[PDB]
Chain length 369, copies 2
């Protein structure tokens, strides 16, 4: 009675955004994502989400291309061997190069399935975990400092224990100074989104005076050497994102001295097994690791909350209630956020149940096998 | 004005019959599929480029179908946003697209070809010093029957090849190498490890260090820099990286970690000619032996490979062969000349080839994108 996949179903969902995306390729009025439902011989069902964007701006994977790699190469690989432990999936997919998000979509669903098989919450496989966890908040560029200061104040009023400010060349030292002045002990970090170059090192060093938790990806998404040049000169921890796809990338960053913090995203790293290996390595080498979001639906969000609930993830991550980005979700229950703290879903697997009514109005169904 | 006004873009999805079908985890492939792109300006000049990506993501992540999609959905629209004057502008235009190196190169290489023709020059006139004819190497798979192996090496040498590449595996390395170095103590020989080894096999690889090998290619994982550096520090022989080198920055990291002393360069894998030129230069500046690898290109990609590899910096013969070595027929009108291990570099404007309308009709599906 080993895990014997009876069927695989998928929903191509398009969830309306409260704030549509503007990309170099056009506008996006909704976040598109594919859901995968893997049913075993027992009737148990594992849920997974393909979160890849519709354009290769953040990273190379896109929804349409990963969707193809899943049906043409990954699913066939997944269906050849009987799986005993979810950790075996990463090994099974090993022969497929790249396509991390496509792998994660299927791999995370197998972990969910396995958990349900054991009649346990997936959290039971992540070692010690919290029931509720503080989450951070991120503010975009606010040229009107007074209003920005207003935002931080409301953030603190709502109990958020950490704040992230997006930053760019002509907007960094001034706004960070203002917030550090009105909030001396507030955990603060900045997000440079690759907006700087090595020539801006002088400017970036000024931030060392404001006790920031970290400065995220100031240089190119594919750079290690420039970041190392900066990290050597900074007391503040530099954080990498796009560049960290696996345990080995963390090992290369550590070797080069590229950073002292890692932004971890399960889909970007290919799944839970890889995310777990990366988190363990960061713990052993003083690399502050935290979890980031990717506009996931409730399916991916549930998993993020559970994974981020481990004590290790002490720095509040980028996780919010689904309604922060959407009007509705495709799962039946809402996540509860009270004073910057969210409850970690309990219940078998990821602890969420699909909303057939909403899936019916926002998605296209298809039985792969 | 001196800008290339693109009037039309045409594509051909080709499937060229292989003399030896591919065997993949997804099935046998009787032909090498690839897409050709033709970019015509207002003067009637036409640039040719090729999308070489395999039909499965086993070598590298890109696949023919997915890159084909990225090209029409993202790259072509981007390509058409500026009135391009210099081919170097393409890689900058494409910079915002993450990854998709092979898709980028397909169009980027066509623009270089178009520009050269526009300037009334052979593409070689843009690669600095270049040779008219160049020696190419030969590859040889695993051969447990040493006697025959020695026979094939004897054949290659008799045929003029000045370098041989042997596929190697954990229980098959020193044996065939020692045999060849004993019968050809002066022949340039390299070994392709195809990521079949692990760091624990160090002692076995060290034994190879005493056969004057030009290099040992990617003994460890395709995405590894650190294990390779550990090995490299223990060997006199040059370690060569491939899958892992997508840009100049990747070479900079490899050099900083001491991962290798040689680079397998493939234009498609690197995103085009511009990045390839930056990589070759950095290699020449840092004593990294660079050579051109192959990807079963049709005559379009092959013509470019010969022209780029003709630069004297590419001292080590690369994996470039006549199209006949892998295919029955080609989609260009003329076969490449190969005499005693030496191939003729295409002269003529751009990459110097003309498409075979007859063969394109036999082996491809046409589509006018713009």
């Amino acid at each position: 009675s080993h895990m014997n996949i009876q069927s695989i179903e998928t929903y191509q969902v398009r969830l309306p955004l409260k704030t549509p995306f503007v990309t170099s390729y056009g506008r996006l009025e909704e976040k598109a994502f594919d859901l995968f439902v893997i049913t075993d011989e027992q009737g148990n069902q594992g849920f997974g989400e393909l979160v890849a964007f519709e354009q290769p701006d953040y990273v190379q994977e896109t929804l349409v291309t990963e969707r193809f790699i899943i049906q043409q190469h990954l699913i066939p690989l997944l269906l050849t061997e009987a799986i005993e432990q979810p950790q075996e999936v990463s090994t099974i997919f090993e022969e497929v190069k790249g396509h991390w998000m496509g792998k994660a979509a299927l791999e995370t669903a197998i972990w969910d399935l396995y958990a349900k098989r054991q009649q346990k919450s997936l959290t039971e496989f992540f070692g010690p975990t919290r029931r509720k966890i503080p989450v951070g908040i991120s503010l975009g560029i606010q040229e009107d400092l007074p209003q920005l200061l207003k935002q931080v104040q409301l953030a603190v009023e709502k109990g958020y224990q950490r704040v992230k400010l997006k930053i760019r060349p002509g907007y960094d030292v001034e706004p960070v100074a203002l917030i550090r002045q009105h909030f001396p002990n507030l955990p603060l970090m900045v997000d440079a989104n690759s907006a700087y170059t090595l020539a801006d090192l002088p400017q970036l060093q000024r931030l060392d005076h404001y006790q920031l938790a970290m400065i995220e990806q100031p240089f190119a998404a594919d750079d290690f050497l420039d970041h190392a040049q900066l990290q050597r000169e900074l007391k503040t921890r530099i954080c990498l994102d796009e560049n960290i796809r696996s345990l080995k990338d963390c090992q290369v960053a550590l070797a080069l001295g590229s950073c002292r913090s890692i932004n971890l995203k399960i889909p970007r790293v290919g799944g839970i097994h890889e995310a777990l290996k990366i988190a363990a390595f960061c713990q052993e080498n003083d690399l502050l690791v935290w979890l980031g979001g990717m506009f996931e639906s409730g399916v991916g969000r549930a998993l993020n909350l559970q994974f981020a609930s481990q004590p290790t993830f002490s720095f509040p991550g980028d996780i919010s209630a689904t309604e922060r980005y959407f009007y509705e979700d495709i799962i039946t229950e809402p996540f509860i956020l009270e004073q910057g703290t969210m409850t970690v879903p309990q219940g078998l697997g990821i602890g969420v149940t699909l909303s057939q009514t909403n899936l019916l109005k926002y998605s296209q169904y298809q039985k792969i096998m």
